[PDB]
């Protein structure tokens, strides 16, 4: 169905300022809007979006209000300026998914049979991506219901277009990477990976702590996946693995040795050239 979704910075800025301008008026918690984008093969692209009047009550999670005519006429109005765009799904800025999401998704599945839900965090505090992508599906199991509606995650990333790229480059004057080389290849890849892995393990720790003491709704799929995780850890004490590891490392170090030798030779040549060329400049002054 869907493999990857790509998000442009334009919709992010639109989400941010919509949240600001609607939350300044009063103490609302969640806001809703509709996205526009394009399809190609199994890859989805999001270009722009517009807001919509939405109301929800904190007293109960079964009462809420959206506007149909607003959405219809606003889509018709954006049609007259660019016909390539089309309705693809909706977004809500909630920190975490709510109970009513299934109902709203069913409500606006009429305009797009393959609606995709997107969650944007407006005040991130970590290095992770602010966007999360979900798609509805029907799940089946042993007993309880033949089918049940459930969300499933889809990989998301932030893309860029040429004009958008030059705009965001002009906007990001203060912050720019120091060097491109082993620096950006090391810190941006390895340390952040350790951070993310530790965070994930902490979250699963928290859920496991919630069980066998507290609420205790023992679920079995999580247990099956945990067994699969704990069974897949390799063993590094095997003799053959150690021998192969040593062989490959010894094979690899020779190349660095050779490159260092070449660099030393080039440095000596440069020193000779500079000294010879510069020693012949003092006598010209007389």
């Amino acid at each position: 169905a869907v493999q990857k979704v790509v998000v442009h910075p334009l919709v992010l800025l639109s989400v941010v300022d919509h949240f600001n301008r609607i939350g300044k008026v009063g103490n609302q918690k969640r806001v809703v809007g509709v996205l526009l984008g394009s399809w190609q093969k199994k890859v989805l692209d999001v270009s722009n979006s517009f807001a919509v009047p939405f109301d929800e009550d904190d007293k109960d999670d079964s009462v809420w209000f959206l506007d149909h005519d607003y959405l219809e006429n606003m889509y018709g109005m954006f049609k007259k300026v660019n016909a390539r765009e089309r309705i693809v799904g909706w977004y809500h800025t909630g920190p975490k998914l709510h109970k009513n999401d299934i109902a709203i998704n069913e409500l606006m599945k009429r305009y797009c049979p393959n609606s995709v839900l997107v969650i944007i965090d407006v005040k991130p505090k970590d290095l992770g991506l602010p966007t999360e992508a979900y798609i509805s599906v029907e799940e089946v199991h042993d007993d309880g219901t033949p089918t049940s509606k459930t969300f499933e995650h889809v990989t998301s990333e932030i893309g860029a277009e040429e004009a958008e790229e030059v705009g965001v480059e002009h906007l990001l004057r203060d912050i720019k990477d120091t060097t491109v080389g082993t620096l950006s290849q090391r810190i941006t890849n390895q340390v952040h990976g350790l951070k993310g892995l530790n965070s994930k393990l902490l979250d699963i720790r928290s859920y496991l702590e919630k069980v066998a003491t507290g609420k205790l709704p023992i679920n079995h799929q999580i247990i099956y996946q945990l067994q699969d995780v704990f069974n897949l850890l390799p063993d590094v004490s095997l003799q053959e693995f150690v021998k192969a590891f040593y062989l490959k490392t010894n094979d690899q170090m020779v190349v660095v040795y050779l490159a260092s030798l070449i660099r030393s030779v080039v440095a000596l040549h440069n020193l000779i050239n500079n000294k010879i060329a510069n020693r012949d400049a003092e006598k010209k002054e007389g």
């Binding site: 998914l97 459930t150 999580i222 995780v229 897949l232 192969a244």
Partner: protein, 182 residues
């Protein structure tokens, strides 16, 4: 079932199987099932249970063609024996890793010298891999391991670990969403 093993034979078997009118004739469906499942019998039970079953009914005319003709009967019985021993060889090479020679001859209902003669032409024709040492009666079915392959498998295992750990957390959050909302 007379065709030598190949991908075209395999997918033709898969397409020809599961016919609504095929169940009208159960014996040949049973033969197809026997040739499509795992490790197959030696030689005796099928020749003792289907030899006579190829004379009755109102469809045994190809069976009478296979048996009654002298030269055709001999050639096709030899071909069927070769096919079943090939199937046994393939399955025992898929599941075993190192085997004695006496057990190999025992499972094939034929002597040790014919066993090695039947595996030699196969291995020199580049259809299966096998290395037999006949000073200790050992047969080895596994290739030597290069240093690259071990680390490649290790890296693949690491990638699978990371992917499944990523998968678990989203389901964790979805499960938690519907119990502590209020």
């Amino acid at each position: 079932i007379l065709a030598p093993f190949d991908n075209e034979q395999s997918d033709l078997v898969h397409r020809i199987s599961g016919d609504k009118k095929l169940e009208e004739i159960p014996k040949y469906k049973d033969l197809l099932k026997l040739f499509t499942t795992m490790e197959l019998m030696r030689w005796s039970t099928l020749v003792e249970d289907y030899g006579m079953e190829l004379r009755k009914g109102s469809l045994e005319s190809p069976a009478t063609d296979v048996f009654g003709s002298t030269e055709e009967g001999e050639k096709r019985w030899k071909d069927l024996k070769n096919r079943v021993v090939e199937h046994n060889i393939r399955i025992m090479a898929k599941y075993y890793t190192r085997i004695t020679m006496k057990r190999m001859a025992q499972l094939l209902d034929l002597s040790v010298d014919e066993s090695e003669a039947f595996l030699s032409n196969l291995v020199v024709n580049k259809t299966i891999f096998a290395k037999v040492d006949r000073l200790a009666g050992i047969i080895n079915f596994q290739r030597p391991k290069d240093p690259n392959n071990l680390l490649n498998d290790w890296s693949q295992k690491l990638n699978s670990l990371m992917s499944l750990v990523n998968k678990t957390t989203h389901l964790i959050a979805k499960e938690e969403m519907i119990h502590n909302l209020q």
